[PDB]
Symmetry: C4
């Protein structure tokens, strides 16, 4: 196809910062660096004014000159129009360089660290269904590859949480070969099923919860991406079916996602 | 917890799509693209410079072309120094252009490695599959082999069948061998079509009738990067040749005759 | 195929050992180390400069200190230009110093990210394990929980036993549950000591006699980087408390009382 | 613990170059870049001499000056002592910059690409053994973590190749919890074993070969590193045993590898 309150576990402001460094959006990433870039120069520019006769030909003479020189020395561009006169000028200048490169290095580190973030995301049907299939009462939930990055050859595990014990639900099929389109995961509610004999009311009574999870590899980076979804009992629709998301035209069949989490009683 | 075919209807943000091409594109095209992006980036600042008169000291050649060739100076952090921001505004732009430039380099480099990271070892499959009498029973075979310079040995495989039923039921075809130790040469994967086989009793015509499809998939690790590379192939029913055999490539092996067969 | 305790007696090349510390070391120490490596690197070239007289034009302060502060100029590709290689030799050094410098930056950056790459999510185990009557039978339990900011949910675990036999036989203790869906809080891993259990009929004294040891291991993926992080823990027999229970941390949970127990 | 001739499969000189870029040793890596660095300037320096009056203050006047300016413009250091006079001077200069950065970028890419190479290596005993253990005739081979980087919690698969069919040999233990020391892998040669009833001579007759393979993760990078070893039939020693590689002193037991692949008949 084309197109709770933790208490006692030590947290560090450091790690939290990194977390946002990755969760944040691109535009916000740089703007943040900018606001961090300016701040970094302001700091050295001031550090320069401390000693008089800092940079030769410091223009515009004053703080603004010491600033626009900072940006020069920090990025290793070094025009040379300015030049450390006094020893102290150098001492600062030199220390500012070590900072600058480390500056670049860390940013670049983050920049790639962000690229590394897995790409292929997997959408689940906001609603799950229980419907008579091939004679017996089965349960189904469908998911499908959602980003440009493909996951084919994906395997899945389906669970149940209720009053709090955790039950495994045997899937009719555990792995899916050509996931590149969509997947309709389903679990038969026969004698062995932990769900056997459980009316919609019987679920609520025990605060039931359905947990699915699909793992698979991004064929493009080898990164093994996993994704997870949870349904509340009031999110399972009884005796419903998934609106078919796959038309056909000119002998060519396509698949419309526009109506992905939509259902219709049987 | 806190301390104390084709698809339609997809998202598809322009950003992500751009990155995708940044990786799918070929090397030459990668850089040329940057070039065309590099020029564009300077043109933009050069213009931004002309806005204020007396921008760069000794701006030669005096005019737009000078402001351009200065841009390339300030953006790459090379900074000859022949030019120099005179007016405050000159600096304001210059300084903002630097932050951009480095970020420029950083992103490119990020992409550059992001491309290196792409898994390397590719696995070719025989454009044609076969069903032939082997050791008494009617078995099915398809062969694949490591294709790039990067090796995959110790590779495991899963073989599937897709047909229409009463929906496209996906069946697991039991392979005679699931894993292959020394894959460094080639692999002849095969599935016996006995009583248990979902393919048992199915004439070539019987396949078409249900739009049958064979899906194989081989996973294994690139011993050189540890990257676990997977590859996949699909055969249509008219791509299975009946009562055929794979021409023995082979001490010399002629991978040219890889997907070639001969009736028994 | 071509087209057409402590250990002794180990290899341990100095290079690899250096890299190991490059990653084990703490951030502050990382840079300071580079600094001390940065200075050293210039001192070396500055001296290399003094060898030939009339090295850098306008070398200020005239003397070694000038040749130093020029080094830092030429090594970081900042190149103010106040100084300039006069003599040919000046250039020869200067040019060779540049190749070094960039390689300098490149390697550092390489390390810098190589450190970022280090898996983040860490998993703490209860310093003490317990054996207690649960649901009728004598079972054994140990609990662990996600410890860093980075989450591991959907984690699976393997539990082992090491004792001396007639060699240190390694036995697999069947866990009541092998995988845990929502690990985002905590996990209470437990193994029933019935007839099949290799621990069946073994008094606390019976353990020591054979130098018993409990080895657990939890694997799971950091949902944020896809990196599959594993963690491991070992208990000595005197670290198992008999007929005890884990103090319920818990809506608030006090992870401070994590490895605390109370007899039943 | 502390301390064949392929014919028809397309190869590209490109890919082959990268392969060496990673297989090569560090010193050789850079020297190679150097020799590649010089070459790169020589090329532009010449490209400069084509047009007269290339770089202002081109010292030493001549080719050597155009060279030492190249190194200036290529590394984005740009002293500024030299400066493109003629338009052509710039045209070259500008094109040389785009190259230079791409230069750095690719090198850095390689530099990290090398760091990424898995680290933890796993040594196998050059010799394997078949010895009476606990009554029955079993076969053993030992391996142990070899680099500074640890693999614990390692699993292994053992195979047999003979006249050419490939047999799986059931290991007494498939996975090893605390691999941080050493591992003695062993396969009982009872009725079910494909090796049952096979004298050392019986092996050779069919060109037997033993293939082991251990996979496990580097707890430090999450990289799942695998390693592989092969024994010829004349590399299996019969009725031998592995010299014990684990002494004890002061109540503290250590492990000497100095005698790792050494054996002694029973
Ligand atoms: K300069
Ligand atoms: K400069
Ligand atoms: Mg520079
Ligand atoms: Mg001036
Ligand atoms: Mg002039
Ligand atoms: Mg002066
Ligand atoms: Mg001069």
């Amino acid at each position: 196809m084309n197109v709770v309150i933790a208490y006692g576990m030590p947290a560090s402001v450091w790690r939290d910062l990194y977390y946002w460094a990755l969760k944040v959006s691109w535009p916000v990433f740089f703007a943040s660096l900018a606001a961090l870039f300016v701040v970094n120069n302001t700091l050295f520019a001031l550090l320069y004014q401390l000693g008089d006769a800092p940079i030769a030909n410091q223009s515009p003479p004053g703080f603004v000159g010491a600033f626009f020189f900072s940006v020069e020395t920090l990025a290793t561009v070094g025009y040379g129009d300015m030049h450390p006169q006094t020893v102290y000028a150098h001492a600062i200048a030199t220390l500012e360089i070590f900072v600058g490169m480390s500056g670049i290095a860390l940013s670049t580190g983050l920049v790639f660290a962000r690229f590394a973030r897995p790409r292929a995301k997997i959408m689940f049907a906001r609603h799950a269904i229980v419907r008579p299939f091939n004679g017996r009462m089965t349960l189904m939930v469908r998911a499908a590859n959602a980003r440009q990055n493909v996951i084919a050859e994906a395997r899945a595990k389906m669970r149940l949480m209720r009053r709090m014990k955790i039950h495994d639900l045997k899937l009719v099929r555990n792995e899916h070969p050509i996931f590149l389109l969509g997947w309709n995961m389903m679990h038969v509610i026969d004698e062995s099923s932990p769900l056997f004999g459980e009316t919609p009311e019987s679920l609520a009574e025990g605060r039931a919860m359905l947990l699915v999870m699909i793992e698979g590899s991004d064929e493009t980076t080898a990164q093994v991406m996993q994704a997870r979804h949870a349904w509340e009992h009031d999110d399972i629709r009884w005796h419903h079916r998934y609106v078919d998301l796959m038309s056909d035209v000119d002998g060519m069949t396509h698949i419309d996602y526009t109506r992905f989490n939509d259902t219709e009683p049987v």
